[PDB]
A paper describes a structure:
Nsp10 belongs to the superfamily 1B (SF1B) Upf1-like family of helicases, which could unwind both DNA and RNA duplexes. In addition, this family of helicases contains an N-terminal predicted zinc-binding domain (ZBD) which is conserved in all nidovirus helicases, including 12 or 13 conserved Cys and His residues. In this paper, we present the structure of HP-[name] nsp10 in full length and truncation, which has a different domain arrangement compared with other helicases. The N-terminal ZBD has 13 conserved Cys/His residues, twelve of which participate in the coordination of three zinc ions.
Author numbering: 4 to 148, 154 to 252, 259 to 273
The structure:
């Protein structure tokens, strides 16, 4: 049961960039195309139903997306046999509507009859963003105004520490000492071996993973969409300089603490 990334209402449709949207919000997403009930992009004028003009979006997500130009992927054919496809896991727009492809024991599982289907993969740009949750969680978050001794006192084994780059991830691992992590695939840096115990250290672009308390290292330098993705699922304790395009808009609303 998918919910609208803007307002939280039931979302039968999705943007090309991966945001779920309700009937209303199909027409307020200027960033990229939204295929609607008639099968055409909203406001395209391909038929009577998609003739009405688009509106300008009023979510700060829409402001963030002004700096992220939509790059449309090429149409690829999804071969399906015995409920399996060669195409990677993800969400795809087809003539049967939206279709999910999930990794399983046998391979990439997809709930479609045997055949070949023209498909357009949705981008991960706005994957799992929920602005209703962001508005709630940001007010119960905290930006903490090196002072790594503070982090060691507060951090626990069940916590998760998100971090922007491979370099910042490496430096966080050295500062913590004993900690769990997965070494990023295709990295030029020399990471140490992950311990059996300790707090998890995860690369920000990997998205949200369940944890007790969550931290955002160098929050001012972090990708805006990834931050929103994180605040869609949990409150954060943000770290580093407040400022150093600019930092994400959420940090103007977020409560602060010194020391
Ligand atoms: Zn909506
Ligand atoms: Zn979009
Ligand atoms: Zn139409
Ligand atoms: Zn600001």
């Amino acid at each position: 049961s998918r919910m609208c990334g803007y307002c939280g209402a039931p979302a039968p449709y999705a943007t090309a960039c991966g945001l779920d949207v309700c009937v209303y919000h199909t027409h307020f997403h200027q960033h990229c195309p939204v295929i609607i009930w008639c099968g055409h992009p909203a406001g395209s004028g391909s038929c009577s139903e998609c003739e009405p003009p688009l509106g300008k979006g009023t979510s700060p997500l829409d402001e963030v997306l002004e700096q992220v130009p939509y790059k449309p992927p090429r149409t690829v054919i999804m071969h399906v046999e015995q409920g399996l496809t060669p195409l990677d896991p993800g969400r795809y727009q087809t003539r049967r509507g939206l279709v999910s492809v999930r990794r399983g024991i046998r391979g990439n599982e997809v709930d479609l009859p045997d055949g070949d289907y023209a498909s357009t993969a949705l981008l991960p740009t706005c994957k799992e963003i929920n602005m209703v949750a962001v508005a709630s969680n940001v007010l119960r978050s905290r930006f903490i105004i090196g002072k790594t001794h503070w982090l060691l006192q507060q951090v626990q084994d069940g916590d998760v520490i998100y971090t922007p780059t491979h370099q910042t991830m490496l430096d966080m691992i050295r500062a913590l000492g004993t900690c769990r992590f997965n070494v990023p695939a295709g990295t030029t840096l020399q990471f140490p071996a992950p311990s059996r115990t300790g707090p998890w250290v995860r690369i920000l672009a990997g998205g949200w993973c369940p944890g007790k308390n969550s931290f955002l290292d160098e929050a001012a330098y972090c990708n805006h969409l990834d931050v929103l993705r994180l605040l869609s699922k949990t409150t954060l304790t943000c770290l580093g300089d407040f400022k150093q395009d600019s930092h994400c808009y959420v940090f103007d609303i977020m409560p602060q603490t010194q020391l």
